[PDB]
Design a protein around this ligand. Structure first.
Ligand SMILES: [Zn+2]
Lengths: 148, 264, 149, 166, 108, 95, 292
RNA sequence: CACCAACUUCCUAAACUUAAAUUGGGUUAAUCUAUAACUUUAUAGAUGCAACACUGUUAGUAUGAGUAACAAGAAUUCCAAU
């Protein structure tokens, strides 16, 4: 599958945490139905937990649009341009709350196999080994077998 | 169309110019051959004496045909006719650059037309100053026997009574074969014609008539050193120390016009 | 395996080849220009040239009369050979027949076609090839060489 | 059956803006029903690919195969419409961009034999597709010289990245 | 003996697309100066030959009518004359064929 | 299944690569791989094999110093073996 | 520096082209009827002063373009690339015409002009080389001749065999580059300014202006190089297939300057020559060619 | 005078102990009906409701393979001609 699947290296969006941490998620859209068994858990979530999340994270734009809808859906947009959609069809309040928290923590970075879990811009401090390292010199820089 | 087209030498030659071209080619060939007639007068390379183990150069000849020959003993022996045509040294190879054991010399004969030949072949021959030859063959020659390129070779190099080895391509028999080089060993030479450069060789020679063959001294152990009493480098008509007879005969050979042989 | 062969295998047998060649020769004499396959035309070209020699030999020749009768099925042609073809070619020493290549037949077999005709005939001239003129640049350059020589 | 090749000739491009090069003409021509094998016809198509209009026509005139005559007829029809409908100024300024053949609807019959055997008889039909681009055929590719190969090999070595290392 | 397995299209494609099996281009194409049509270097023109062959039939058709019967090949030389051309003294004692058309430019 | 099987062997293969690189680096300094590991253990050094490769590649000067410590402990270890245990522990062998 | 002369010379050539283009407003349709032996009577409506004979060849077939080297407009020899001027009768000239004498001269002139280009750029910029004129010699002479005057510093310098080979390499590069022959008819006054430095070129320009009632002179430009032409020239440099600098002969009365006449031979792609034939022609082309 | 080597074992996070007829328990794709929903969903009630495999049945298209295979007497002035 790895041969048939893509991979990447460790990277950061714009060195987010160097100066101050910025939340990647920027906009949340919620679709609900007044009368739908699938939206029952979402219906209760709006009553109780939606306000708490908004107060906890006031920097994410939240859109709640109750409308006649077959399947409730949640759309999350990230600063880097990543957009993710999650179906809320017949999911409980607790499931919804956990999912939103996971979405906020997650970044727009692609989720694929990472070849190296470590990223460094200055891997060497004392200099990278080269063949001439540890090779003893000779007087006058005489090459081997040189009669001179 | 801006595309390649097929061309031949006669495509753009007019009838009047075509006749002139034919005459010019004959004149050019004659002039080139005459210029190379005198090797000894062309800064010849140093001449060395014969010593045991020396190997002389060979010649290329055309298979004219066969005829019957009678000896003074009354025996009849069939013989084959070989003609040496425009035999000239072309390229000498140094001993080190070809083979440490012995040096080699390239000899070509039977001049051919220049109309349907590659430019590269013509360019090499232009430098040598000779018309192109049908076949190139390589002869193993010792350093002492090396001859400068462009030296004309004549049928008089060999002499009657000398055994020789001839190699030629066998006749091809088609899908069933043939068309492979083969050598016949131990063929005696009965007579040589100086005027027409014709050598009479005992036995049969592989190949069809009018086919070029390679002639070289016999390599059998018995005839290890036969060149001691023969022209060591080669026979030079340029020297003309003593004009040779037009026809050379072996002692046993019964010459025509001789008295009828009586077994007394 | 066609090495050294001097005869083509035509018809259903050697006799058929002679008869087929006989028919071709008779037709050529009557018309003086015939189109046929290149292989057959080449084979019959030699026969036609020799026939003209027989006509040149003379009418009184018994062998020529027998030869003419056998080769020419139509007997009206026998006077023609001795009185038309033979007089015409008296000056010529040979090359009585002209054979040229014709575009291959578009008959789904793509046979090689050639036309054989008797020279000096009254028929319209065939479209023969014309050699390049000496006025061409290359020929003119050779002309300058000729003048120098 | 699908006839999208013809629709390619019905495509209309938007009006060219002043800052746009003159669009080269593209002509698609095909013959849907030909009593000829596509496989045999493909041989003709493959050779003529990339050749000029005149060179391809000249070769076809001296070709022995029946398909070649059909191809020349197809080429002539495409050329006629190109000047008539695609505003082609110079007839000679055409080359064969694409040439390929496709399968066509066939007919099925039973092949009788003299000894009571039978066989499957088929009447083969094929389609032929060609696209003609106004202008001379593109210049041929030049094989890479030894110097070019060596430079790339050195470049490839430099481009190498260390595998499975810190 | 029957094939042990189906032959792959890729294997089949390589065989048919091998250079030995592909159709080769011809470089011997030439132009006919007389008709301006294409020809091969070793092949004659056909557009003009069409005139020559048809003219021969027309001449032959005139000859056939004049003879009027089979086995009537003359024992004397024959000549063809076109309208506007009058027999000469040298034409005496030769079969004369009269053609309604004028002397063709190519025909001399 | 092949990917699932490769998960187990992949970790083992990576460990083998790290050991091989250490052996090549150690031999260049004249120290065998078993000696270097044993001396480091005797020095209460708990660096893992992966990090050991990393230090040599990017910290050759530090690795040489690390080689000296292993060599010095090896010298003390040889002295202890020659001493037969009667001699006190070496300065660098103190734990 | 010689490069400076080429830059200004090129500009005046470019400015003259623009003036002529501006001179003609809009595209005027001219009915040109084909009087050529093949496909006679075809009439093309072409743009005046823009359309060239090569466009008509493109209209008919690719064979016409390849085999047409010159055009006869109303019985007058016209360059295949020279823009048409008015309704006229056009015929195409090929290398295989029954009388190629007119065609040969155009090839003869173009080869001489090409040779002149090689001489000026063959030497280093330090040396000073002035072209005097291109002598017109018959094809029968066996070589085309170009006269050039060298500086006193080169009085003792003669090309060697290797130097002659280098000149062919430069000429062969020009043929490989395949530069089309630009054609401009310019008045003497402008032409004199363009070639003011070369006094020898000044007189040649005057001669052409004297012959015709006006001062218009025929100027041909090969890339940067520009020169006067006695008549029509080859459309492109790629026509030549074999090229050789046979020999150079120094004129005896050459005290003020060393006047050298260079001998060369060239053959078009349409007319290739055998290796042996070419060698003989080159040998026959190494002899001094006088004008008779 | 050792190292290497098994998920055996330890370690971070977890996990809570070794084949296959048969037997116990929990889910689910698709279609229709009842009642809802309204870009294709829910709860019930139903069923011609899930196929990499029966020398399976029907249709299509390959492979063998462009292979086996097959064909008109001559010339001309012309196929209801000589
Ligand atoms: Zn014609």
């Amino acid at each position: 599958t790895g041969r048939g699947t893509s991979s990447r290296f460790l990277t950061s969006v714009l060195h987010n945490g160097l100066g101050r941490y910025v939340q990647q998620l920027q906009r949340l859209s919620l679709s609900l139905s007044r009368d739908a068994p699938s939206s029952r858990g979402a219906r209760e979530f709006v009553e109780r937990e939606v306000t708490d999340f908004a107060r906890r994270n006031p920097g994410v734009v939240v859109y709640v649009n109750p409308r006649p809808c077959a399947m409730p859906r949640i759309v999350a947009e990230y600063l880097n341009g990543a957009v993710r959609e999650e179906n809320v069809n017949s999911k409980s309040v607790e499931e919804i709350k956990s999912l939103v928290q996971k979405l906020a923590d997650q970044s727009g970075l692609d989720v694929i196999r990472i070849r190296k879990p470590f990223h460094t811009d200055n891997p060497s401090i004392q200099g990278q080994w080269h063949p001439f390292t540890n090779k003893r010199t000779a007087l006058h820089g005489l090459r081997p077998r040189e009669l001179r | 169309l801006h595309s390649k087209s097929s061309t031949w030498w006669d495509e753009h030659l007019s009838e009047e110019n075509l006749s002139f071209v034919k005459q010019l080619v004959s004149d050019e060939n004659k002039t080139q051959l005459t210029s190379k007639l005198n090797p000894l007068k062309d800064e010849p390379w140093p001449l060395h004496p014969w010593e045991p183990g020396s190997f002389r150069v060979g010649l290329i000849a055309l298979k004219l045909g066969m005829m019957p020959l009678w000896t003074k003993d009354g025996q009849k022996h069939a013989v084959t006719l070989l003609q040496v045509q425009d035999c000239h040294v072309l390229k000498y190879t140094p001993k080190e650059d070809h083979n440490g054991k012995i040096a080699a010399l390239t000899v070509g004969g039977k001049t051919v037309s220049r109309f349907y030949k590659p430019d590269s072949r013509l360019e090499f021959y232009r430098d040598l100053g000779l018309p192109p030859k049908q076949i190139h063959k390589i002869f193993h020659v010792t350093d002492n026997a090396v001859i400068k390129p462009g030296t004309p070779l004549y049928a008089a190099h060999f002499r009657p009574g000398q055994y020789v080895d001839v190699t030629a391509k066998t006749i091809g028999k088609g899908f069933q074969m043939g068309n492979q080089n083969r050598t016949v060993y131990g063929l005696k030479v009965w007579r040589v014609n100086t005027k027409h450069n014709i050598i009479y060789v005992n036995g049969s020679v592989p190949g069809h008539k009018n086919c070029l063959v390679k002639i070289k001294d016999s390599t059998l152990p018995a005839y290890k050193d036969s060149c001691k009493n023969l022209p060591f480098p080669t026979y030079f008509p340029d020297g003309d120390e003593e004009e040779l007879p037009e026809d050379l005969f072996d002692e046993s050979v019964w010459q025509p016009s001789e008295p009828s042989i009586t077994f007394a | 395996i066609s090495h050294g062969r001097v005869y083509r295998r035509l018809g259903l047998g050697p006799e058929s080849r002679i008869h087929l060649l006989r028919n071709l020769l008779t037709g050529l004499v009557r018309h003086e220009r015939i189109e046929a396959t290149w292989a057959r035309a080449d084979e019959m070209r030699g026969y036609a040239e020799k026939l003209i020699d027989y006509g040149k030999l003379g009418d009184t020749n018994e062998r020529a009369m027998r030869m003419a009768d056998f080769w020419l099925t139509e007997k009206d042609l026998i006077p023609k050979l001795f009185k038309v073809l033979a007089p015409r070619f008296q000056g010529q020493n040979g090359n009585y027949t002209r054979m040229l290549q014709i575009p291959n037949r578009k008959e789904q077999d793509r046979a090689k076609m050639a036309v054989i005709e008797y020279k000096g005939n009254y028929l319209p001239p065939l479209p023969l090839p014309h050699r390049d003129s000496n006025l061409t640049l290359l020929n003119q350059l050779l002309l300058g060489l000729q003048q120098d020589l | 059956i699908s006839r999208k090749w013809e629709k390619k000739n019905k495509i209309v491009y938007p009006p060219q803006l002043p800052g746009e090069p003159r669009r080269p003409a593209e002509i698609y021509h095909c013959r849907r029903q030909i009593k000829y094998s596509k496989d045999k016809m493909w041989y003709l198509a493959k050779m003529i690919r990339g050749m000029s209009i005149d060179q391809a026509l000249a070769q076809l005139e001296f070709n022995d195969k029946k398909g070649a005559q059909i191809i020349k007829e197809v080429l002539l029809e495409a050329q006629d419409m190109a000047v008539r409908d695609h505003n082609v100024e110079f007839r000679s300024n055409l080359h064969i961009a694409e040439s390929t053949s496709g399968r066509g609807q066939c007919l099925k019959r039973i092949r009788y034999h003299g000894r009571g055997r039978f066989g499957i008889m088929e009447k083969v039909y094929c389609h032929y597709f060609v696209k003609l681009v106004e202008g001379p055929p593109p210049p041929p590719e030049v094989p890479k010289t030894a110097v070019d190969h060596a430079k790339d090999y050195i470049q490839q070595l430099r481009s190498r990245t260390i595998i499975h290392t810190l | 003996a029957a094939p042990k397995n189906r032959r792959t299209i890729e294997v089949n494609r390589c065989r048919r697309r091998n250079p030995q099996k592909l159709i080769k281009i011809k470089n011997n194409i030439d132009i006919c100066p007389e008709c301006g049509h294409l020809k091969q270097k070793h092949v004659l023109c056909g557009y003009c030959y069409e005139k020559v062959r048809q003219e021969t039939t027309k001449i032959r058709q005139q000859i056939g009518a004049q003879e009027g019967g089979p086995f009537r090949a003359p024992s004397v030389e024959t000549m063809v004359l076109y309208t506007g051309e009058k027999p000469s003294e040298k034409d005496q004692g030769k079969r004369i064929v009269e053609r309604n058309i004028k002397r063709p430019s190519w025909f001399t | 299944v092949k990917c699932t099987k490769a998960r187990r062997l992949k970790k083992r293969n990576l460990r083998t690569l790290w050991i091989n690189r250490i052996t090549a680096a150690s031999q260049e300094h004249g120290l065998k791989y078993p000696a270097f590991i044993v001396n480091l253990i005797k020095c209460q050094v708990e660096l893992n094999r992966k990090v050991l490769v990393d230090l040599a590649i990017y910290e050759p000067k530090t690795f040489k110093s690390l080689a000296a410590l292993a060599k010095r402990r090896q010298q003390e270890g040889f002295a202890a073996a020659l001493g037969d245990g009667k001699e006190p522990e070496g300065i660098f062998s103190r734990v | 520096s010689p490069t400076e002369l080429t830059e200004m010379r090129n500009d005046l050539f470019n400015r003259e082209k623009s003036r002529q283009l501006s001179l003609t407003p809009r595209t005027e349709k001219i009915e040109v009827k084909h009087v050529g032996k093949t496909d006679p009577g075809t009439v093309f409506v072409m743009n005046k002063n823009i359309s060239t004979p090569y466009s008509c060849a493109m209209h008919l077939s690719e064979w016409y373009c390849s085999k047409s080297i010159l055009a006869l407009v109303d019985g007058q020899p016209w360059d295949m690339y020279k823009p048409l001027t008015k309704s006229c009768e056009i015929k195409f000239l090929t290398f295989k015409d029954p009388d190629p004498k007119e065609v040969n001269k155009a090839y003869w002139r173009s080869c001489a002009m090409m040779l002149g280009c090689v001489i000026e750029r063959a030497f280093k910029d330090d040396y000073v080389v002035s072209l005097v004129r291109a002598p017109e010699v018959p094809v029968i002479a066996g070589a085309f001749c170009y006269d050039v005057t060298l500086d006193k510093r080169l009085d003792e310098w003669m090309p060697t065999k290797e130097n002659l080979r280098s000149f062919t390499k430069d000429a062969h590069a020009l043929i490989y580059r395949d530069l089309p022959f630009e054609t401009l008819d310019v008045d003497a006054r402008v032409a004199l300014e363009i070639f003011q430095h070369n006094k020898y070129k000044v007189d040649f320009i005057e001669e052409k202006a004297s012959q015709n009632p006006e001062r218009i002179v025929k100027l041909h430009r090969i890339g940067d190089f520009i020169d006067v032409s006695e008549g029509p020239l080859i459309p492109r440099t790629s026509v030549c297939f074999q090229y050789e600098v046979s020999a150079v002969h120094n004129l005896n009365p050459s005290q003020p300057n060393l006047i050298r006449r260079f001998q060369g031979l060239s053959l078009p792609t349409h007319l290739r020559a055998q290796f042996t034939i070419w060698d003989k022609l080159v040998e026959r082309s190494r002899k001094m060619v006088t004008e008779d």
